[PDB]
Design a protein around this ligand. Structure first.
Ligand SMILES: COc1nc2ccc([C@@](O)(c3cncn3C)C3CCN(C(C)=O)CC3)cc2c(Cl)c1Cc1ccc(-n2cccn2)cc1
Ligand SMILES: COc1nc2ccc([C@@](O)(c3cncn3C)C3CCN(C(C)=O)CC3)cc2c(Cl)c1Cc1ccc(-n2cccn2)cc1
Lengths: 214, 217
């Protein structure tokens, strides 16, 4: 793996994400001044369980199909066999969406962007699982403290996705060195931007699997 | 700091540790087979409180001296001001020693290499510190479960020593610069040897410090 090749891999991943980031960051950052009123939050807390679970399920399905088109533009992901691709997505697509959701999180007032405005974890009271919504906020709070750049999110979520330890793979070691060159490109780019201080502040991926299982 | 330069950094840390590891790992596995007899274990249990904390203090001062030379061979450490070097050493050296003792530990029979042979925690009965000795054995048993390589230990102890969160540093940004590079060197090496799974199974931090507040006299 030549130096100029891993530097092209950084770019390749960084534009695959910018093309499939669903929402542009500058639109998320200028909308946090806009906040749900107390009357509007009431309207969400009054919604039934079914209606509230089904809205969020439609936003997850929408976000997951942006993650799929993010993997299908990764150089190397297309080359893997069709079974390994579905295995890597059916296990890593949900974890990528959670990492992507930190761009919509505003640590000032502890709110996330949802269906037009920014709102705290009061909106999702109708779901009946405050502890799951709470840990999603506390995880998003951790990623927001680092101020992750779009390129850092692009390379990180790629490593979340391309992991050669998922059960069910067949051409394992072909996913291994593909995972390695993404580790190479991620470690590479962090040096150029002097951002290697975030690696120790990165959550363990035991947490992400734990949240998705719930 | 390029990636090839932290490639240099990984090799330099694994070289300093090799030159300053006090006991060779292969000799510890060879000495692993020979174990204290009960007649010998009793001989230690009859020693004084003073006679037994005089030997360990000699071994702890001897082992700490190897940690100093380890740091003095890490380049980057030697170009810090001496006030920060001392501060890092008084807070770090004893905790490096606790991590290095995991190599002298045998999980098959909960024994450890001490003064010639292997012995259980009953060997240190004369100290009267049954929970400190038990906390150490509990700590080494968790580290031996990860099968630390001689290079994973080298990089982990380098991070244990180089911490910008120490009180008393004033050129603090100088330290975290060297600390951030050792973090990437640690991750970049765990990738090369397919060993990132040990990042999660590492002790929490504040766990070695809770193993060194246990130290009045
Ligand atoms: C804390 O709960 C939530 N937080 C969210 C934060 C941001 C966003 C987005 O802003 C966004 C930004 N980038 C990507 N996403 C998904 C949404 C973009 C689309 N959108 C438009 C355009 O209005 C709605 C808003 C959606 C959230 C949702 Cl649906 C939720 C709700 C939620 C419920 C359950 C889970 N779960 C169960 C198991 C594992 N996990 C996860 C989550
Ligand atoms: C369970 O207690 C101990 N375990 C030990 C395990 C191994 C070794 C070595 O094998 C070794 C290997 N690598 C490095 N070390 C230190 C010793 C090499 C030297 N040696 C030769 C050549 O015979 C004696 C053996 C020494 C131990 C000692 Cl002294 C002890 C005793 C001890 C008591 C208290 C503390 N404490 C107070 C505050 C924090 N902690 C620490 C310790």
């Amino acid at each position: 793996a030549s130096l100029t090749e891993i530097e092209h891999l950084v770019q390749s991943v960084c534009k695959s994400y910018r093309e499939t980031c669903q929402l542009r960051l500058e639109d998320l950052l200028r909308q946090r001044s806009n906040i749900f009123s107390r009357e509007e939050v009431t309207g969400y807390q009054r919604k039934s369980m079914w209606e509230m679970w089904e809205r969020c399920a439609h936003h997850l399905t929408e976000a997951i199909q942006y993650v799929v088109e993010f993997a299908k533009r990764l150089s190397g992901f297309m080359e893997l066999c069709q079974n390994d691709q579905i295995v890597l997505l059916k296990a890593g697509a949900m974890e990528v969406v959670l990492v992507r959701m930190c761009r919509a999180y505003n640590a000032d007032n502890r709110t996330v962007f949802f269906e037009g405005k920014y709102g705290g974890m009061e909106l999702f009271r109708a779901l009946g699982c405050s502890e799951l919504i709470s840990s999603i906020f506390d995880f998003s709070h951790s990623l927001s403290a680092l101020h992750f750049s779009e390129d850092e999110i692009a390379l990180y979520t790629a490593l979340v996705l391309i992991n050669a330890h998922r059960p069910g793979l067949q051409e394992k070691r072909k996913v291994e060195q593909l995972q390695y060159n993404l580790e190479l490109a991620f470690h590479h780019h962090l040096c150029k931007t002097h951002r290697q201080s975030i690696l120790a502040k990165l959550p363990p991926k035991g947490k992400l699997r734990s949240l998705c299982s719930q």
